[PDB]
């Protein structure tokens, strides 16, 4: 015979904020890795102390 | 630090080729043959299935 409030209390599944996608190579740039990502003559130059 | 075994040459005049970009110089030993690094695979075996 069901329940009166049970139907109303049911709510849909919640929101998913972000959608996953493929990130092809070359999109990532200028990260915090110590590996050499600085490009051009700027990377080769080293300051004198 | 990395070590000298690259410079060690019987006749360094013909064997060494360098270009000086802004800060530091790239050095080639003409006789030394480049070799791919085995035993550095991304995943050793990785049965895909």
From Swiss-Prot, chain A:
Q: Which domain of life is it from?
A: Viruses
Keywords, in A-Z order = Virion
Q: Where is the signal peptide?
A: none
Compartment list: Virion
Comp. bias (Basic and acidic residues): 44-49
A GO-annotated cellular component: T=7 icosahedral viral capsid
Summarizing the function annotation, the protein's role is: Plays a role in virion morphogenesis, and is ejected from the infecting particle into the bacterial cell.
The molecule here is called Protein 6.7
From which source organism is this entry? Escherichia phage T7
Swiss-Prot record, chain B:
Name the cystine pairs. Answer: none
Q: Where in the cell is it found?
A: Virion
- Per the record, the domain of life is Viruses
- Which first-to-last residue range defines the signal peptide? none
Transmembrane stretches in the record are none
Cite the record's note on assembly: Interacts with head-to-tail connector protein gp8, the tail component gp11, and the fiber protein gp17.
Purpose of the protein: Structural component of the short non-contractile tail. The tail complex is involved in viral genome delivery. Forms the end of the tail, including the canonical tube, the nozzle, and the small extensions below the fibers. Once the tail tubular structure is formed, the interface between gp11 and gp12 generates the proper environment to interact with the six gp17 trimers.
Q: What's the name of the protein?
A: Tail tubular protein gp12
What residues of the intact protein does this structure contain? 101 to 149 of 794
